[PDB]
Enzyme design. Structure first.
Site, PDB file in Angstrom:
ATOM      1  N   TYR A 141      -8.251  30.867 -18.739  1.00  0.00           N
ATOM      2  CA  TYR A 141      -8.706  31.955 -17.793  1.00  0.00           C
ATOM      3  C   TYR A 141      -8.301  31.491 -16.383  1.00  0.00           C
ATOM      4  O   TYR A 141      -7.764  32.277 -15.779  1.00  0.00           O
ATOM      5  CB  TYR A 141     -10.316  31.169 -17.610  1.00  0.00           C
ATOM      6  CG  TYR A 141     -11.168  32.087 -16.874  1.00  0.00           C
ATOM      7  CD1 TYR A 141     -11.486  33.457 -17.081  1.00  0.00           C
ATOM      8  CD2 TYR A 141     -11.695  31.703 -15.693  1.00  0.00           C
ATOM      9  CE1 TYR A 141     -12.459  34.155 -16.224  1.00  0.00           C
ATOM     10  CE2 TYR A 141     -12.521  32.226 -14.818  1.00  0.00           C
ATOM     11  CZ  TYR A 141     -12.780  33.627 -14.929  1.00  0.00           C
ATOM     12  OH  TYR A 141     -13.540  34.384 -14.407  1.00  0.00           O
ATOM     13  N   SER A 166     -10.031  38.784 -18.151  1.00  0.00           N
ATOM     14  CA  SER A 166     -10.234  39.083 -16.935  1.00  0.00           C
ATOM     15  C   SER A 166      -9.070  38.428 -15.971  1.00  0.00           C
ATOM     16  O   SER A 166      -7.838  38.619 -16.400  1.00  0.00           O
ATOM     17  CB  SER A 166     -11.464  38.558 -16.272  1.00  0.00           C
ATOM     18  OG  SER A 166     -11.974  39.293 -15.219  1.00  0.00           O
ATOM     19  N   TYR A 167      -9.185  37.022 -15.433  1.00  0.00           N
ATOM     20  CA  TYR A 167      -8.552  36.273 -14.848  1.00  0.00           C
ATOM     21  C   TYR A 167      -7.269  35.768 -15.778  1.00  0.00           C
ATOM     22  O   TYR A 167      -6.163  35.503 -15.753  1.00  0.00           O
ATOM     23  CB  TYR A 167      -9.032  35.268 -14.041  1.00  0.00           C
ATOM     24  CG  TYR A 167      -8.263  34.698 -12.744  1.00  0.00           C
ATOM     25  CD1 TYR A 167      -6.914  33.863 -13.019  1.00  0.00           C
ATOM     26  CD2 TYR A 167      -8.517  34.921 -11.525  1.00  0.00           C
ATOM     27  CE1 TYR A 167      -6.284  33.220 -12.134  1.00  0.00           C
ATOM     28  CE2 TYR A 167      -7.723  34.195 -10.554  1.00  0.00           C
ATOM     29  CZ  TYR A 167      -6.708  33.626 -10.673  1.00  0.00           C
ATOM     30  OH  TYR A 167      -5.963  33.276  -9.549  1.00  0.00           O
ATOM     31  N   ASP A 187     -14.912  50.218 -17.511  1.00  0.00           N
ATOM     32  CA  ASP A 187     -15.011  48.941 -16.800  1.00  0.00           C
ATOM     33  C   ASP A 187     -15.095  48.984 -15.526  1.00  0.00           C
ATOM     34  O   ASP A 187     -14.380  49.755 -14.571  1.00  0.00           O
ATOM     35  CB  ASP A 187     -13.586  48.099 -17.128  1.00  0.00           C
ATOM     36  CG  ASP A 187     -13.777  46.600 -17.077  1.00  0.00           C
ATOM     37  OD1 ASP A 187     -14.685  46.051 -16.120  1.00  0.00           O
ATOM     38  OD2 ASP A 187     -13.305  45.807 -17.937  1.00  0.00           O
ATOM     39  N   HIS A 245     -16.919  45.685 -19.041  1.00  0.00           N
ATOM     40  CA  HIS A 245     -15.967  44.509 -18.843  1.00  0.00           C
ATOM     41  C   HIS A 245     -15.993  43.583 -20.027  1.00  0.00           C
ATOM     42  O   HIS A 245     -15.270  42.503 -20.034  1.00  0.00           O
ATOM     43  CB  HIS A 245     -16.249  44.029 -17.408  1.00  0.00           C
ATOM     44  CG  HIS A 245     -15.156  42.695 -17.107  1.00  0.00           C
ATOM     45  ND1 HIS A 245     -13.942  43.089 -17.256  1.00  0.00           N
ATOM     46  CD2 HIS A 245     -15.111  41.671 -16.521  1.00  0.00           C
ATOM     47  CE1 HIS A 245     -13.097  42.169 -16.887  1.00  0.00           C
ATOM     48  NE2 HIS A 245     -14.142  41.286 -16.348  1.00  0.00           N
TER      49      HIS A 245
END
Ligand SMILES: *[C@@H]1O[C@H](CO)[C@@H](O[C@@H]2O[C@H](CO)[C@@H](O)[C@H](O)[C@H]2NC(C)=O)[C@H](O)[C@H]1NC(C)=O
Ligand SMILES: *[C@@H]1O[C@H](CO)[C@@H](O[C@@H]2O[C@H](CO)[C@@H](O)[C@H](O)[C@H]2NC(C)=O)[C@H](O)[C@H]1NC(C)=O
Ligand SMILES: *[C@@H]1O[C@H](CO)[C@@H](O[C@@H]2O[C@H](CO)[C@@H](O)[C@H](O)[C@H]2NC(C)=O)[C@H](O)[C@H]1NC(C)=O
Ligand SMILES: *[C@@H]1O[C@H](CO)[C@@H](O[C@@H]2O[C@H](CO)[C@@H](O)[C@H](O)[C@H]2NC(C)=O)[C@H](O)[C@H]1NC(C)=O
Ligand SMILES: *[C@@H]1O[C@H](CO)[C@@H](O[C@@H]2O[C@H](CO)[C@@H](O)[C@H](O)[C@H]2NC(C)=O)[C@H](O)[C@H]1NC(C)=O
Ligand SMILES: *[C@@H]1O[C@H](CO)[C@@H](O)[C@H](O)[C@H]1NC(C)=O
Ligand SMILES: *[C@@H]1O[C@H](CO)[C@@H](O)[C@H](O)[C@H]1NC(C)=O
Ligand SMILES: *[C@@H]1O[C@H](CO)[C@@H](O)[C@H](O)[C@H]1NC(C)=O
Lengths: 201, 728, 726, 201
Positions: free
Chosen positions: C507, C590-591, C668, C700
């Site tokens: 992450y 995501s990240y 998203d 998302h």
């Protein structure tokens, strides 16, 4: 007993050629020449009678068909003339002594000018299986067009199309009608159809 | 190279040379040589320079195209080309004087011009800019605005809307000059109530918030754009007053509901032919309209109307065929269906409703190419009974029983697929042979029908292909239930009938389409057959054209039925021919081709191992009206809504668990929208079906950008090389 | 028998919890078999507060309930429709306890956005159509408070998108006074905020798709303005309009764009507001007192408190909330000490300085309960492991006396604790979540004794005895003198001699921690138990809870260090002898997808394949509050160069060496599909082949049952094909 | 005979924009003005009570503005609040009279849209803009935040911002306005200060 008045032909906005208004007069006598002085006559063809003997004589009836007609279309109201006017608008009848008058209305007279001129380009009936049969509907002398109810006052554009379903009692199919619009002239140009019968009043 | 590689096709290594000319008179034409416009004489081939490339590079821009006025006195230069949709585009223009040899800087043509054209004679210019028509009497003079109602994405004057450019007109133009330039006919399209498709465009990496495109797109059953046709007198103009345009009303039988304008043909300077088509496209009417000098209108009389309909399907192939009038203008020839159902030439009269056929047989006339006062030239598939072939024919207009082929036996082994381009008055014609050999361009003279010289023989490509192992083509047919259905196989080099090759079914299967032909092609199928040794096969089943009304109209009101089954039956027929590995059979397509591939992979017949659908259709309620409604009618319960719902790709999602599936689509596709492929993947996810997918950012129907074109075929190569277990 | 993928996607082995709601200092509610039960904390005897036959007789499935503080009414939530992470709309029917009747006079309207009781009594305040309504008695007409409510423009009592996701972490913006005299609310104005626009395709029946429009502030774009209002509910004349007084923030934040990040009521005539500048390097806490004859709420400079960061941002994400003593003249707050560690400081209202009561090479995670003699806080001090959470108590009179309340209950089974206290901090429930099976126990604050075990997962234990479950090692590695931690999920029958393939879960976002002591039954459990893959995570620079010097190392330099440490961890994992240096992968969300893409685009040759799910590509594409907290503004006068340098598209050419799978949802609202659309366009422009997948109308999370099981099934086939696993 | 017509005509100023009338030689006569206002407050201080009616007619200065009686407690001497710090502070060095009064109907006195006072007027200076030094007014002088919105505030809590130039000390001047509703009758406030001299009068 009284005097046949022609006032409805002088007040308001006159009707279109396909929606002409008809005045028939009985039990009165007329002063026909005072109406002619009110307008600038441009034509006066009289089939059946004479251009002069119309203003004199006691009849059983005197009819006047009046409407707004442009002089640029004067050739399409002549006797025997083909074109859209005699087919889907107005055809003059010759079953009686009659005259045809195209005159221009001055601003002194109290008749107003409509928005524009109007006649019907097409007035056909689409019928048959698959709606393939198209028969144009032509008017009879002195009668009205069957496409008259589509736009009584006038048309909104040139080439305006109207459709309507013909009921089972009205034979069948779809009635199609196309309108035509001409620009309004400087002074209101009119059309008058006078006819006469007999029987010694 | 030893074999035809993927690099050889993606990059263009083996190039085919063309000879494109523009007939500028009855015996001379223009030709571009090293950016030099050259003028050739058709008789003796002697030529001279028309414009030098020293002129081409005095500008500060790249010239994209040119258009010489029909008087030889001016040249129009096109630049700042910007593509929009299939045929439409915007560009700038500069008028170049030829007698003065200078550019015109006085009253120029504005940027972002949508259409522009010359009068058929002289140097008059009419162009469309901001959805309005402007006419220039002389290039150095200011233009006169003809229409004032043009609004972006609402009202189009002189140009088409999306559905008219794509499906009915096949062009962005709606301007029609009269034969001498006195009158100018144009169509007005009103897309006010037409719904809007809204997709996303992401553009360059610099753009923070993406853009939302809005295209007036009438999907199946939606409100269509209304159309009016106006005619303006260009010789009664006045720079002091506004220009007056006269509308020509359609016949009454087509005004009962929605309709289209599918053709505009000028007979003479006072007689214009209009072809109107109903929304339910099995009733068309060719309306001949005559001008009236007194009033100034154009009269469409029922006495000069001619009905062309169809009880078994739709009129024509993709639309009614255009008319071809004679010199007097009191008769015309056009291609319609005979009583048996084959497209042949009929002889009409303007004032008589019936027509006389001049051709007959178990073959079709592809297109009328020329009509003189004595001979009619037409292209047909009559030679050797091959529907996939085309040759030029000449028929005598006084003794129709005297027909002579003009291209059949010229080179029977090298050329079986011909087009033609006639000069003015049909004095000389250029023959363009597409296959089955290397393309061949020749010039001929109509007097004695003798060939003058070879324009292009593709000698450079012939010597380049000598050291390469090219794949062969097998064009043959089979008989399924007493019906001739043609197929086409691209056989690998040194093809052995004993060995079992992997098969790849190339499919489009759209109505009137034809995948089996005698046409030379250096495509991706050439790479798969030469290098990876894969038999590529195409099959023209039900619905395919150029074979009669019976075969073409077999899918009427039922798309996604017989054409899908015939692709399954063709793979079985190809399998039991001997040289096909039953365990390795794939199928791929594009647009309608991808739709059939998705329907085939959803049939559960177990014949196909994998398949690739590129920009496919998924639900005929998602496509435009004019195309979909022509074959399947309206999606209402009172017509054919049930066939709209039985022919969905989402409804066959459970069967995809038996195959390997690759779904490809462009995010900016305007023809078949990404919503189509979005619902496909949404159905296979709701069914627990795994697959491969690939979106292409900001790409259209054809993934035709150079970077994306190489990427889509390199991806599909790896998918087939894995599905067939071939060495990487 | 191994933990298969079907067991993870069909939820075979289910973990059990014990969710209660304290309704007093010694009572709580418990939903058991669709029966609301009341419990006495001291002895554990239960009562039927509401039965089976009461619910499921209204004609709709009940989602949630809300008992009024006086025990006279219950709200009944239904018609639940989700919207973003925390927001949703629903319907509500009130139920009278005494009369045992459903109130039908002046019902709560449909599509209500928020509703809440007062802290005492039975007063209701709900937000409908972006307007606040006050319902004094459940059977009386509600009183409209605001009239400026407009969709996607003005938000009254509710948040917009960027406040809900990043600032408040909640849809709510309503704050009642301690006993319901006032109602503080915020107002947000998204008029100049640009709109993100994407397509929604809905069901197959929709012919033309829908274009969703959400006011989204991207990096540098216009942010929503904030105004906080207070209204007197006890002076509500039913014939007059409601009057809302505005609390003006101090001048230090009114010099530019500012945020509102905390609203805490001190007493009925005192409120606490925390403001934050757009450049989140400077915060202020304003203690506003009431003025009875004037009617206003004033922020005076002596009761203001400044906290700023010279090396990064204030707080871990936002400044920490305060906890006021019962007299209202002081509060305790978690701020950063001189050495970079976040500890509890003792603040006075009109004194600027504060005194730390906690100190060490550890950090305080959160303040839990404050009494007159004890402060209860969760910390990671135990065993020096930053991945642990334990409950501590400290005497306010003698700070030296500090007691850990959870360290040695079951040290082998319980190392990660969360606590839920009762009113007045009499009893507390300890919620252990690892590294063993979750254990829920009830305690008492007097003797600090365990009263009874509420949940021990005895069923999950028995089910997990006949399955070859994997293990989990939690260790550290010192690198350049700094101690960073990692975790490995070792396959069953782990042989240190054989070489295993390695998948690096990542992450790596700011203040993240992928190395903890939490029991999980996820995809990594299937990859280790069934496919014999080693799944490992690493918390390098940028990871929090280890000090400011480690958290603020990636300040204004995102895409650096946090990406290199994931690469260097893969090398050091290979140095352990049991890792196949030819089968190493990395995946994230995501990240995590951003770092995975930057790792794969680095061209280090260490990673073979990789997966990025809904990844960030360019930081100018993401929202303002999050991105600007770590990167500033994207201007040539700020940090524009590192916005351009840290893009995934800049490294598209290095992808010719790796197998890259890119996944993103079409709907998203957080990391837009635009972010992945530019990644694929660069990979095509660079001549790089890769695998991709879009999920239609998925958010998302890709959390629909069919969609959630489709993405992990697809990622399983990709990792196995990349690892040559049958 | 020094008629105070300006204090009686036009829309009165807000407290932060108070206007001053200074007279040196001209002879004054009060009670004329007092007879035009209902004294709800006549708290005189300094040196002279109601004996201010006489004196030697020397340096009679009078401030006037619009001031609601609901804020009357913040105009008294030594009164804390946002009036004495950011709007008006009476100077108690020389003789003075503080007068508050409501105005009768159409006393050629216009009605302001509402009342207005500044609740905040501070400077945000220092490195990183961390120090907020509130700027308090001096007795008799104006406020630095007066330049913002002299006409009034469109909203209670209206924020204003300006960069204080190098010659203005540096930093940012922030002023927040406070808006009070309009009373049914125009409420006013007057401060009358008088000075002596070493020469004449
Ligand atoms: C384009 O189409 C629209 C109708 O779709 C026409 O707009 C109509 O105009 C008339 C006259 O003002 C109004 O009575 C109608 O209400 C309008 N309809 C709509 C839907 O707005 C418009 O005139 C057409 N333009 C042209 C050039 O034909
Ligand atoms: C054009 O196609 C339509 C089909 O959409 C035909 O309409 C059918 O007409 C027959 C009458 O012969 C009816 O029994 C059917 O119910 C009609 N079908 C529908 C769907 O309404 C129409 O006849 C065709 N026209 C021509 C000239 O072939
Ligand atoms: C646990 O036991 C105590 C008694 O020792 C309960 O107190 C009584 O609870 C009943 C049932 O709820 C009430 O009706 C009585 O009013 C309570 N007693 C008094 C004096 O008020 C307590 O409620 C029990 N907890 C439960 C049943 O959950
Ligand atoms: C929300 O902010 C907008 C500005 O973005 C405010 O609208 C402005 O209002 C002033 C005064 O009424 C006008 O002079 C401006 O022209 C308006 N601008 C725009 C873009 O509308 C709006 O009043 C604010 N709303 C609230 C409830 O505070
Ligand atoms: C606020 O954050 C900024 C960093 O974004 C810091 O401001 C810097 O201050 C120094 C002063 O020595 C200037 O030289 C820099 O140019 C400033 N940076 C920028 C980007 O302008 C500041 O340290 C932070 N404020 C506090 C109170 O810590
Ligand atoms: C221009 O034309 C001449 C004539 O054949 C040719 O030799 C030359 O290569 C051409 N140059 C360009 C740039 O087109
Ligand atoms: C087209 O645009 C360019 C700049 O965008 C301008 O220089 C040029 O003059 C324009 N064309 C015309 C004909 O004005
Ligand atoms: C409560 O109802 C459920 C079904 O709604 C039932 O299975 C359960 O047995 C009931 N509870 C008790 C304690 O009987």
């Amino acid at each position: 007993d009284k005097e046949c008045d022609f006032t409805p032909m002088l007040v308001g906005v006159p009707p279109q050629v396909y929606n002409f208004k008809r005045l028939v007069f009985t039990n009165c006598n007329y002063n026909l020449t005072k109406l002619l002085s009110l307008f600038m006559v441009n034509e006066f063809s009289c089939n059946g009678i004479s251009p002069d003997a119309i203003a004199r004589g006691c009849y059983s009836s005197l009819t006047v068909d009046y409407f707004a007609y442009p002089l640029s279309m004067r050739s399409y109201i002549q006797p025997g003339s083909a074109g859209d006017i005699s087919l889907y608008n107005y055809k003059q009848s010759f079953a009686n002594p009659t005259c045809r008058v195209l005159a221009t209305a001055p601003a002194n007279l109290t008749l107003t000018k409509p928005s524009a001129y109007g006649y019907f380009q097409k007035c056909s009936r689409v019928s048959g299986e698959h709606n393939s049969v198209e028969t144009p509907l032509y008017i009879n002398p002195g009668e009205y067009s069957i496409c008259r109810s589509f736009s009584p006052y006038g048309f909104s554009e040139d080439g305006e199309v109207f459709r309507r379903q013909l009921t089972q009692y009205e034979g069948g199919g779809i009635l199609v009608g196309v309108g035509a619009k001409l620009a309004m002239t400087d002074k209101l140009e009119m059309g008058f159809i006078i006819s006469v019968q007999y029987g010694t009043d | 190279r030893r074999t035809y590689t993927l690099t050889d096709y993606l990059k263009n290594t083996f190039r085919v040379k063309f000879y494109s000319l523009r007939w500028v008179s009855d015996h001379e034409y223009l030709y571009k040589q090293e950016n030099n416009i050259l003028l050739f004489n058709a008789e003796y081939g002697n030529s001279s320079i028309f414009l030098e490339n020293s002129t081409f590079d005095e500008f500060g821009h790249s010239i994209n195209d040119y258009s010489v006025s029909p008087d030889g006195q001016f040249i129009l230069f096109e630049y700042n080309y910007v593509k929009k949709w299939r045929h439409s585009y915007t560009a700038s223009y500069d008028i170049y004087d030829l007698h003065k040899r200078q550019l015109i800087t006085e009253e120029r043509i504005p940027n972002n011009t949508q259409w522009i054209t010359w009068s058929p004679v002289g140097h008059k210019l009419a162009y469309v800019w901001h959805n309005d028509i402007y006419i220039k009497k002389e290039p150095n003079l200011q233009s006169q605005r003809i229409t004032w109602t043009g609004k972006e994405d609402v009202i189009y004057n002189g140009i088409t809307d999306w559905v008219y450019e794509e499906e009915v007109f096949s062009a962005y133009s709606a301007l029609w000059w009269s034969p001498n330039g006195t009158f100018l006919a144009y169509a007005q399209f009103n897309d006010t109530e037409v719904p809007l498709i809204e997709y996303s465009f992401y553009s360059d990496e610099s753009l923070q918030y993406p853009k939302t495109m809005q295209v007036p797109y009438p999907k199946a059953g939606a409100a269509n754009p209304t159309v009016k046709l106006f005619v303006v007198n260009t010789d009664s103009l006045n720079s002091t007053a506004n220009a007056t345009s006269v509308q020509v009303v359609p016949p009454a039988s087509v005004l009962i509901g929605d309709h289209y304008l599918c053709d505009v043909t000028w007979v003479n300077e006072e007689r214009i032919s209009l072809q109107w088509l109903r929304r339910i496209q099995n009733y068309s009417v060719l309306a001949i309209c005559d001008y009236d000098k007194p009033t100034g209108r154009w009269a469409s009389h029922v006495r000069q109307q001619h009905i062309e309909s169809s009880t078994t399907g739709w009129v024509g192939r993709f639309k009614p065929s255009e008319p071809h009038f004679t010199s007097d203008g009191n008769s015309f020839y056009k291609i319609i269906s005979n009583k048996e159902g084959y497209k042949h030439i009929c002889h009409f009269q303007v004032d008589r409703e019936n027509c006389t056929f001049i051709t007959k047989g178990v073959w079709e006339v592809i297109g009328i190419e020329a009509l003189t006062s004595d001979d009619l030239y037409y292209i047909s598939n009559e030679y050797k009974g091959m529907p996939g072939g085309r040759n030029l024919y000449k028929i005598q207009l006084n003794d129709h029983t005297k027909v002579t082929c003009l291209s059949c036996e010229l080179n029977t082994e090298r050329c079986q697929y011909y087009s033609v381009s006639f000069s003015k008055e049909a004095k000389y014609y250029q023959l363009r042979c597409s296959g089955p050999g290397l393309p061949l361009y020749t010039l001929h003279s109509s007097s004695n029908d003798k060939e003058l010289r070879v324009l292009e023989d593709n000698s450079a490509l012939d010597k380049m292909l000598q050291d390469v192992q090219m794949p062969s083509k097998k064009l043959d047919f089979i008989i399924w239930n007493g019906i001739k259905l043609w197929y086409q196989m691209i056989l690998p080099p040194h093809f052995d009938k004993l060995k079992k090759y992997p098969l790849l079914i190339d499919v489009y299967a759209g109505p009137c389409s034809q995948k089996a032909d005698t046409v030379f092609r250096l495509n991706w199928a050439t790479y798969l057959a030469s290098t990876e040794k894969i038999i590529v096969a195409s099959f023209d089943g039900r619905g395919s054209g150029y074979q009669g009304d019976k075969i073409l109209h077999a899918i009427n009101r039922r798309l996604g039925t017989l054409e899908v089954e015939d692709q399954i039956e063709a793979a079985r027929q190809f399998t039991n021919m001997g040289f096909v590995d039953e365990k390795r059979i794939a199928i791929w397509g594009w647009s309608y081709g991808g739709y059939v591939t998705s329907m085939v992979l959803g049939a559960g017949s177990g014949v196909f191992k994998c398949g690739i659908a590129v920009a496919p259709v998924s639900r005929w309620e998602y496509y435009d009206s004019v195309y979909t409604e022509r074959y399947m009618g309206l999606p209402t319960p009172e017509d054919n809504l049930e066939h709209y719902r039985n022919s969905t790709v989402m409804s066959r999602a459970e069967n995809f668990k038996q195959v390997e599936y690759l779904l490809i689509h462009g995010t900016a596709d305007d023809n078949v929208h990404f919503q189509q492929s979005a619902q496909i993947s949404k159905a296979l996810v709701d069914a627990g079906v795994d697959f491969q997918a690939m979106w292409y950012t900001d790409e259209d129907h054809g993934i035709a950008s150079s970077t994306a074109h190489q990427h889509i075929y390199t991806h599909m190569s790896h998918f087939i090389k894995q599905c067939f277990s071939l060495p990487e």
